[PDB]
């Protein structure tokens, strides 16, 4: 009822590892399940930091975790390496960077920031051209 | 399938696990709580059960069980939960707590903003646990009952042969 | 040659994990596996 | 398998209240679990829509 | 690389959200630079 007709969540109940699905088969006075499951392969390790403070305010990942390969920080998922640029659409703010321990320094690059800059530069060039007329 | 071992360092973000990790001072690598559990439960009748009754020893000995327990403890406090689903990763404890809170339904900041208070509360709770076991005597009934039942069954079976069963005499030779 | 021996059980390898307070580990690849499992469901009927 | 190697969503299964983690300990012919659970404290009432 | 992908326009609501002001601003710039 649980493994077949739906995706279960109780760990180590419908097969070792994260559960994808199952298939039933009959047998004389018994049943045999084939659990199709998922398992992470080789891994790499990095340096982490729970929070980020940019404008004197803490930043927390929306859904992910902050990793770094030595020079540039990134936010990724918890089960597959795929970094992205730190963006406000990936972080939410709370408090100010004085009470948490282990916080580090970086820059937070809102994507709506260059989205609006795409017309801020338009306004700037419009006014620069308009200075004379 | 891997007997993980505790690291030499013992600074877990302010939390205090000293009461559960194994103690090297004792010849047996038990822990304080396990020591109290072993002392509270009391197990020459065993020598008098020679009349055909034996008590075979368990395959796993207490040290081996303690080693399993130590492996589980060293896994769950350094690798998080992933060591039960493949390759064992490594996560700092102070943020695995944040992941657990996120799982509950509250966000992350609520932990980091009260890290020290939560650590103190957990330390006080784990300290207070010991007194509950040490004071009362009814805490460990659910395991005392099993050994009491086995002892009662063995005693009844042994004493049964003294019954004459309506025969001439209980002793065999006099018949 | 061949002979019967007795010894003490092995609990597996050790694989110590180097815990640190700024170290994280992320997999970069995965795998998909299939695990079999067997369960009895009904013993044979009978009558006397 | 559930309350130790992971966080369980089954209410009132791994401790009275919301569940965080667990710790096992051995005992003669038995096991002892320490469930670390979370419980809300004093509250306040408000008006909702 | 994705299979079965189809063709259509993705309409970011930020586009009309900006546009409601940006086209008005463009008309104002026409009324601004000309005189
Ligand atoms: C850690 O990861 C970051 C992110 O990839 C690495 O920094 C980036 O490295 C790439 C190349 O690996 C740089 O790309 C550059 O592209 C220009 C053309 O636009 C080319 O002329 C350069 O020669 C270079 O290939 C990129 O600029 C650089 N920075 C960023 C922000 O992406 C970094 O190297 C990694 N470090 C380690 C130790 O792995
Ligand atoms: C992250 O960056 C912030 C700012 O970019 C750093 O705060 C800065 O800390 C330094 C040294 O702690 C301050 O310099 C000195 O501050 C004292 C006051 O305590 C002042 O009297 C001195 O003349 C000198 O300026 C600096 O002022 C302060 N920045 C600001 C805006 O106040 C912070 O330390 C960085 N943290 C990490 C982990 O990188
Ligand atoms: C972890 O907790 C243990 C026990 O709760 C601490 O051990 C005691 O620490 C107090 C400190 O006030 C001493 O007075 C006792 O003598 C200690 N008892 C024993 C048996 O060691 C331990 O110091 C704590 N360690 C950390 C790092 O928190
Ligand atoms: C990333 O993990 C690897 C192992 O998977 C680390 O490399 C070894 O880690 C063991 C762990 O105890 C050490 O005993 C060895 O000395 C390490 N060898 C080397 C060559 O480093 C590696 O250190 C980890 N990455 C970082 C940044 O620590
Ligand atoms: C992830 O692992 C898979 C296999 O586990 C990799 O696929 C193999 O790639 C090599 C080199 O390209 C081939 O020789 C093998 O035939 C591939 N396997 C199969 C089953 O076809 C894959 O490349 C890995 N991913 C990354 C990013 O390294
Ligand atoms: C989706 O639209 C793109 C955009 O036109 C199509 O790409 C064109 O494909 C034709 C035929 O291969 C080429 O001649 C054009 O040069 C392509 N243009 C561009 C801009 O790529 C694409 O074929 C369309 N696909 C579907 C399934 O409709
Ligand atoms: C990790 O713990 C050691 C031991 O106290 C400490 O020196 C170090 O600063 C800690 N790392 C971080 C990132 O706080």
Obtained via which technique?
cryo-EM
List the Cα angle A105/A110/A114 in 5-degree steps.
Answer: 130
Subunits next to D (3 or more Cβ pairs <8 Å) are: A, B
Q: Residue B109: enclosing H or E segment and its boundaries? A: helix B109-112
The span from the CA of B74 to the CA of C15, in Å, is 11
In angstroms, the separation between the Cα of residue D13 and the nearest Cα of chain A is 12
Three-state DSSP class for A18?
strand
Closest Cα to residue A52, out of A35, A65, A63?
A65
Could you say which of C26, C37, C38 has the minimum Cβ distance to residue A46? C26
Cβ contact (<8 Å) for B66 and D26? yes
Resolution of this entry, Å: 3.5
Cβ contact (<8 Å) for A43 and C27? yes
CA pseudo-torsion sign B146, B150, B156, B159: negative
Question: Which ligand ends up closest to the CA of C14?
Answer: 4
Residues after which chain D is broken (C–N above 2.5 A) are none
**Burial class of residue B47 in the structure, from the number of CB atoms within 10 Å of its CB (0-12 exposed, 13-18 middle, 19+ buried):** exposed
In angstroms, the separation between the Cα of residue A10 and the nearest Cα of chain E is 32
CA pseudo-torsion sign A74, D5, C31, A13: negative
The span from the CA of B82 to the CA of B70, in Å, is 17
The span from the CA of A70 to the CA of B4, in Å, is 29
């Amino acid at each position: 009822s649980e493994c077949v007709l739906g995706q279960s969540k109780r760990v180590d109940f419908c097969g070792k590892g994260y559960h994808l699905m199952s298939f039933p088969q009959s047998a004389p006075h018994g049943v045999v399940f084939l659990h199709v499951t998922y398992v992470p392969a080789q891994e790499k390790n990095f340096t982490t930091a729970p929070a980020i403070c940019h404008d004197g305010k803490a930043h927390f990942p929306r859904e992910g975790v902050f990793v770094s390969n030595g020079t540039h920080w990134f936010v990724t998922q918890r089960n597959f390496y795929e970094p992205q640029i730190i963006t406000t659409d990936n972080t939410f703010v709370s408090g100010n960077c004085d009470v948490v321990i282990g916080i580090v320094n970086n820059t937070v690059y809102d994507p709506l920031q260059p989205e609006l800059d795409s017309f801020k530069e338009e306004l700037d060039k419009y006014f620069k051209n308009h200075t004379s007329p | 399938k891997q007997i993980y071992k505790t690291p030499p360092i013992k600074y877990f973000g302010g939390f205090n696990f000293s009461q559960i990790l194994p103690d090297p001072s004792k010849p047996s690598k038990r822990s304080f709580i396990e020591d109290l559990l072993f002392n509270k439960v009391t197990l020459l009748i065993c020598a008098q059960k020679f009349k055909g009754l034996t008590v075979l020893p368990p395959l796993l000995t207490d040290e081996m069980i303690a080693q399993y327990t130590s492996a589980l403890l060293a896994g769950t406090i350094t690798s998080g939960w992933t060591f039960g689903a493949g390759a064992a990763l490594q996560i700092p404890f102070a943020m695995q707590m944040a992941y657990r809170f996120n799982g509950i339904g509250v966000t992350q900041n609520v932990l980091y903003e009260n890290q020290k208070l939560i650590a103190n509360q957990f330390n006080s709770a784990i300290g207070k646990i010991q007194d509950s076991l040490s004071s009362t005597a009814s805490a460990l009934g659910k395991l005392q009952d099993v050994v009491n039942h086995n002892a009662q069954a063995l005693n009844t079976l042994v004493k049964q042969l003294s019954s004459k069963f309506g025969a001439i005499s209980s002793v065999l030779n006099d018949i | 040659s061949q002979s019967i021996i007795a010894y003490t059980m092995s609990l597996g390898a050790e694989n110590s994990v180097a815990y640190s307070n700024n170290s994280i580990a992320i997999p970069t690849n995965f795998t998909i596996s299939v695990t079999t499992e067997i369960l009895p469901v009904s013993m044979t009927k009978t009558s006397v």
